[PDB]
Design a binder for these strands. Structure first.
Length: 845
RNA sequence: GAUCUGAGUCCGGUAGCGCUAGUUUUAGUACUCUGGAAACAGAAUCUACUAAAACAAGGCAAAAUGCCGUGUUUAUCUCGUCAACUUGUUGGCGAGAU
DNA sequence: CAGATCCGCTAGCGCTACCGGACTCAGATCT
DNA sequence: TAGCGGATCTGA
C-alpha cells in the first residue's frame, strides 16, 4: 500500500524490527520478537546423552552375551549365585590355580564389565603424575610388565583399601592378556573348547569402529562405509549435484600443479604465460621425479635464472613451494611398473579408495574389487599407505575439464570457469510468496545465528504480508561477524532477484551505526527491556535515513512497542532430574528425603557446622550410632569460631576424620547423611530396586502445560507433566488415565470445562494483569511462575531496587476472579483467543 | 572491499566409537551395642570398601543382534477441501479475533 | 494465606570422519 | 547453566 524502509536488529535472543515510512520519515510500527537463545550446549548434551545410553546398552548387551556363553557351557546357571565372591581374588587365583565354575563365571563377568581403554594402547603419553588417562595407564603399564591387571588391583585393594577410582584405568590389551592367561589355565580343568576362548576374547575386545556406527536400524546409522563417507563429504563448489573429489586424487594434484605453473611469470619470454611444451616438460621432469618440487630444480628445467621466476606462491619466509602429487610418488615407490603410473584414472581410483576407507583390510578388499593390473602385494603396500584425508573443493569432472583446458592456456581457474560459463543458480524456488526458511538451514551458521536468522526471516515475511513490499530491508547482527550477515543478504538478494520484486538489502556499518547512536541523544541504561532492541532497530532504519533521504523523530517518544514471545509447545523434553534420592520415614509419619553432605574437609564449605547448630537430630548419625556423632561434635564445639572445624582438625592431626573406633581402626568418613525436607512431588523408582526397604525417588518433574478449569466459580488448574506425554506412531498423545487422575486430585466437577491451555511463554491475563507463563511452580500449592511481557522481572526489580528476590509466583486459587488466554503473532499484535476443547494429540513431523 | 583456487596454523560445529567415574538399592565384610557367668550371632543400618543392577518415564525387537527416548523448527480459533494407515490432530488456501 | 527465604539441579577425558569460519600468503575476476 | 521446581516459614 505505502512504501517504507524496514530496519532489523538481529540478536542472540531477539529480533527487533522497526518500520519507518519513506514519506513522512516517522515510524509506522516497531516491535520485538523474543525467543530463548539457541545453545550448542543443548544439542551437545542431547548427543552426549545419546552416546552414553548406547554405551550403557552396549555394556549390558556384552554382559548378557557373556552370560549366554557361560550358560551354553553350563559354567553359570540360574541356580548359582555370583554374590559372595570377590572377583579380584578370584581372578588372581585363576591366573595360577583352579577355581570353581561359579567363581569362574564371576571372574569372566567382571572382566567383561570393565574392558579398559583402546584409544591409549594405540597412543599413550606420560608426563610425571597427572589426572589424565593417557598418563595414568602409562604408570599402570609400568606396573603391569611385572604383574597382571588383577594382581596389581588386588595389591592396591590391600594397600589403600579400595580399587575403584582414577587409579583403576587400564588398557584393553592388559585385560586381554590377563583373561587369555586365565582362560589358558582354566581350560585344563573345565570343559572349554578353543572356540569358546576365542568367542570370549572377541566379546572382551570387540567394540564398534567410528566408521561403522550404530546398527543401521538407527536413524543415525549407515548401510556401508562408502555411503557413510558419501553423506559426510561436501559437494562441488561449481556443480552442486557433484560430490567433491578427494584432494589427493592424481587429477586434482595435476590440476593444482598446472594452476601453480600458470601463475608462473617469466621475463625472458617477454610474455606472462608459460609455454605448453615447456610446462609439460617441467611437470614431466620435475614433478614426476621429486616428491616435492623445488623452484631451483624447476629453474634447471626452464633453463632460466631463479630471479627471473616470479608469481610462485610462498608462505611467509619459507621457500617457494609448489603442489606435489603425493599419490603418484607413493604408487611409484611400491610399483616401478609404468602402466599404473601412466594410467591417471587408476591413481584417481586408488586415492579415492585410500581416502574413503579407514581400515587397511577394507582398502585391500576394494583394491581387489578394482580388478586393476597390479598384484596383491602392491595392494597390501597401498593398504599400508597413510596420509590421505580431506576433499578437494572441486569435483573430479570439473577438475578434468579444467586441467584439459589448463594444459594449453595459462589462465587461472576463475577465468577458465568463466569461459566455461558456469553461472550460479539461486536455490530459492520463488513459487512461495514468503522467503523460504530452508535457505537459512542451507547456510552453515552457529546455532544461535541460525535460530536468529529463522526468526528474522519469519519477521520479514510477516511484515511484508501485513504492510507490503519494503522499499529497503536493513539488517544488523550481534553474533557471527560480517560473514553471517553477508550470507543473510545473499539469501535475501537472491530471493528478491529471482522473484523480480527486487528490494535493496543493506547492512549499515558498525562504525557508522556507532556514529549515528552518538549523534543526538539515545541513552542506553541497564534494565531497559526489550524496547531497547526495538529502539535499536528503529535507530538502524534511522541510520539508513541519514545515508539516503532528525527533527520531530517519533523514535524519541514511541510507547507502542509490541512484544512477541516464542511459545514452546515441543513435547518430549527433559522430564525429570537425573539424581536419585533415598527417603526415610520420620517419627511423626512423614516421608523425608535423605541428603548427603559432601566436601566435609573444605574451608569454603561450612554446612556441616550449620547443620549441627540448627538441629543435630537432622543428622542420621545422631539418631543411629551416636558415639561417633558425639566425637564429631566434640571436635565441632572445640574449634568454635573457626568456620569449618573439619578441615582444621584434619590439618592438625594430618588425617581426615574417622568414624569412632575403640581399636582406632574405624573407616574414614567422606560424606554424612542428614534428613531433608519432606517431598510430595516425586517419581517412584522403587520398582527398579527390588526389596528396597525405603522408597527411592527422582525429583523435580518438569511440566509440559497446565489447563485452567472453572467449576462453580472457583478456578481450577491441572498440570500435564512431560511424563504424561507418550509417543505412538507419528504423534505424541497425553495419557488419558494420567489426565483423569490429575483431574481427580484437583477435584474438578464433571460438568466443568476448561477456559484454556497454557504452554511455556504463553500469555495469560490473571485478574486483569497480563503476564507470560514460565511454568507451574507448585502443582499442589496451585501456584504458577509468570514473568512480565515488556521487561523481565529481574530487570524491573533492579530498577525498583528492592530486597525481594526476582521471582513472581501467582496463585490460581478460589480467590482469583478471572483467567484469560492471549496470543500474539510474530509481529507482536495481541489478540484475545478462543480455545478448542481438550487437546490430547500433538503432531510430530 | 567482495567471490574463486591451495598452502598452512588457530577456533567452532555435526555425527560416531569408547574410558574411568557419579547417584541409588540389595548382598557381603569391616565397626556399633547386646546377651557373655561361655560358645553363637540377635539386633542397629550410621560410616567405609567390594560386587550386580537401575539410571531421564518408557517404547520397539526377537536373541541369527541390536535400535529409539533430554535438540531443530511452533500464536489461537472456525471454514470447505486433502493426507494421514479414516473423530478432534496435521500438507495448503481462505477468514475472524486489539 | 501470601510472599519471602532457602535450596538443590551427573562428570571428567580421548580418540575419529567430514563440514565451516577467522586470520596470511601467492595469484585470478567484479564493484 | 543461572533459570527453574519446590519446600519452609514467618507473619497469624
Amino acid at each position: 500500500k505505502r512504501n517504507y524502509i524496514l530496519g532489523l536488529a538481529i540478536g542472540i535472543t531477539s529480533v527487533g524490527y522497526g518500520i519507518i515510512d519513506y514519506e513522512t520519515r516517522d515510524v509506522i510500527d516497531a516491535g520485538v520478537r523474543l525467543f530463548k537463545e539457541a545453545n550448542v550446549e543443548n544439542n551437545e548434551g542431547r548427543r552426549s546423552k545419546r552416546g552414553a545410553r548406547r554405551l550403557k546398552r552396549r555394556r549390558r548387551h556384552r554382559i548378557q552375551r557373556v552370560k549366554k556363553l557361560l550358560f551354553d557351557y553350563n559354567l553359570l546357571t540360574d541356580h548359582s549365585e555370583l554374590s559372595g565372591i570377590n572377583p579380584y581374588e578370584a581372578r588372581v587365583k585363576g591366573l595360577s590355580q583352579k577355581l570353581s565354575e561359579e567363581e569362574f563365571s564371576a571372574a569372566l563377568l567382571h572382566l567383561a564389565k570393565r574392558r579398559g581403554v583402546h584409544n591409549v594402547n594405540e597412543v599413550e603419553e606420560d608426563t610425571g603424575n597427572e589426572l589424565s588417562t593417557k598418563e595414568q595407564i602409562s604408570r599402570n603399564s609400568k606396573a603391569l610388565e611385572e604383574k597382571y591387571v588383577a594382581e596389581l588391583q588386588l595389591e592396591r585393594l590391600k594397600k589403600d583399601g579400595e580399587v575403584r577410582g582414577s587409579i583403576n584405568r587400564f588398557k584393553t590389551s592388559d585385560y586381554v592378556k590377563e583373561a587369555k592367561q586365565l582362560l589358558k589355565v582354566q581350560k585344563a580343568y573345565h570343559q572349554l573348547d578353543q572356540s569358546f576362548i576365542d568367542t570370549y576374547i572377541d566379546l572382551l575386545e570387540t567394540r564398534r569402529t567410528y566408521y561403522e556406527g550404530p546398527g543401521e536400524g538407527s536413524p543415525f546409522g549407515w548401510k556401508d562405509i562408502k555411503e557413510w563417507y558419501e553423506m559426510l563429504m561436501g559437494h562441488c563448489t561449481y556443480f552442486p549435484e557433484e560430490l567433491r573429489s578427494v584432494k589427493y586424487a592424481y587429477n586434482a594434484d595435476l590440476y593444482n600443479a598446472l594452476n601453480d605453473l600458470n601463475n608462473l611469470v617469466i621475463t625472458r619470454d617477454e610474455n606472462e604465460k608459460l609455454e605448453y611444451y615447456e610446462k609439460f616438460q617441467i611437470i614431466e621432469n620435475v614433478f614426476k621425479q621429486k616428491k616435492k618440487p623445488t623452484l631451483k630444480q624447476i629453474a634447471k628445467e626452464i633453463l632460466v635464472n631463479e630471479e627471473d621466476i616470479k608469481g610462485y606462491r610462498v608462505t611467509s619466509t619459507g621457500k617457494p613451494e609448489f603442489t606435489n602429487l603425493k599419490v603418484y610418488h607413493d604408487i611409484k615407490d611400491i610399483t616401478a611398473r609404468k602402466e599404473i603410473i601412466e594410467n591417471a584414472e587408476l591413481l584417481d581410483q586408488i586415492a579415492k579408495i585410500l581416502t574413503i576407507y579407514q581400515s587397511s583390510e577394507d582398502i585391500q578388499e576394494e583394491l581387489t574389487n578394482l580388478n586393476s593390473e597390479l598384484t596383491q602385494e602392491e595392494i597390501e603396500q597401498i593398504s599400508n599407505l597413510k596420509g590421505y584425508t580431506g576433499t578437494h573443493n572441486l569435483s573430479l569432472k570439473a577438475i578434468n575439464l579444467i586441467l584439459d583446458e589448463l594444459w594449453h592456456t595459462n589462465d587461472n581457474q576463475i577465468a577458465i570457469f568463466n569461459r566455461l560459463k558456469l553461472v550460479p543458480k539461486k536455490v530459492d524456488l520463488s513459487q512461495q510468496k514468503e522467503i523460504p526458511t530452508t535457505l537459512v538451514d542451507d547456510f552453515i551458521l552457529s546455532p544461535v545465528v541460525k535460530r536468529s536468522f529463522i526468526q528474522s526471516i519469519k519477521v520479514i515475511n510477516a511484515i511484508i504480508k501485513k504492510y507490503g513490499l519494503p522499499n529497503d530491508i536493513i539488517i544488523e547482527l550481534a553474533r557471527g561477524g560480517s560473514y553471517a550477515t553477508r550470507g543473510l543478504m545473499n539469501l535475501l538478494r537472491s530471493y528478491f532477484r529471482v522473484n523480480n520484486l527486487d528490494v535493496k538489502v543493506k547492512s549499515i556499518n558498525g562504525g557508522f551505526t556507532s556514529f549515528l547512536r552518538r549523534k543526538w541523544k539515545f541513552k542506553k541504561e541497564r534494565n531497559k527491556g526489550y524496547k531497547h532492541h526495538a529502539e535499536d532497530a528503529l535507530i538502524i532504519a534511522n541510520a539508513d535515513f541519514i545515508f539516503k533521504e532528525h527533527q520531530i523523530k517519533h523514535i524519541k517518544d514511541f510507547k507502542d512497542y509490541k512484544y512477541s514471545h516464542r511459545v514452546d509447545k515441543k513435547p518430549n523434553r527433559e522430564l525429570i532430574n537425573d539424581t536419585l534420592y533415598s527417603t526415610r520415614k520420620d517419627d511423626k509419619g512423614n516421608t523425608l528425603i535423605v541428603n548427603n553432605l559432601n566436601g566435609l574437609y573444605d574451608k569454603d564449605n561450612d554446612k556441616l557446622k550449620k547443620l549441627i547448630n540448627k538441629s543435630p537430630e537432622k543428622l542420621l548419625m545422631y539418631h543411629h550410632d551416636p558415639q561417633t556423632y558425639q566425637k564429631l561434635k566434640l571436635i565441632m564445639e572445640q574449634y568454635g569460631d573457626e568456620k569449618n572445624p573439619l578441615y582444621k582438625y584434619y590439618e592438625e592431626t594430618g588425617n581426615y576424620l574417622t568414624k569412632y573406633s575403640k581399636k582406632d581402626n574405624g573407616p574414614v568418613i567422606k560424606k554424612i547423611k542428614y534428613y531433608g525436607n519432606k517431598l510430595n512431588a516425586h517419581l517412584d523408582i522403587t520398582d527398579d530396586y527390588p526389596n528396597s526397604r525405603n522408597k527411592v525417588v527422582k525429583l523435580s518433574l518438569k511440566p509440559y502445560r497446565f489447563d485452567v478449569y472453572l467449576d462453580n466459580g472457583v478456578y481450577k488448574f491441572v498440570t500435564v507433566k512431560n511424563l504424561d506425554v507418550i509417543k505412538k506412531e507419528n504423534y505424541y498423545e497425553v495419557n488419558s488415565k494420567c489426565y483423569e487422575e490429575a483431574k481427580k486430585l484437583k477435584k474438578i466437577s464433571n460438568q466443568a470445562e476448561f477456559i484454556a491451555s497454557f504452554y511455556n511463554n504463553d500469555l495469560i491475563k490473571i485478574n486483569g494483569e497480563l503476564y507470560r507463563v514460565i511454568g507451574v511452580n507448585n502443582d499442589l500449592l496451585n501456584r504458577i511462575e509468570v514473568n512480565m511481557i515488556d521487561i523481565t522481572y529481574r530487570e524491573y526489580l533492579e530498577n525498583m531496587n528492592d530486597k525481594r528476590p526476582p521471582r513472581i509466583i501467582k496463585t490460581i486459587a478460589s480467590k482469583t476472579q478471572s483467567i484469560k488466554k492471549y496470543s500474539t503473532d510474530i509481529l507482536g499484535n495481541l489478540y484475545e483467543v478462543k480455545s478448542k476443547k481438550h487437546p490430547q494429540i500433538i503432531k510430530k513431523g
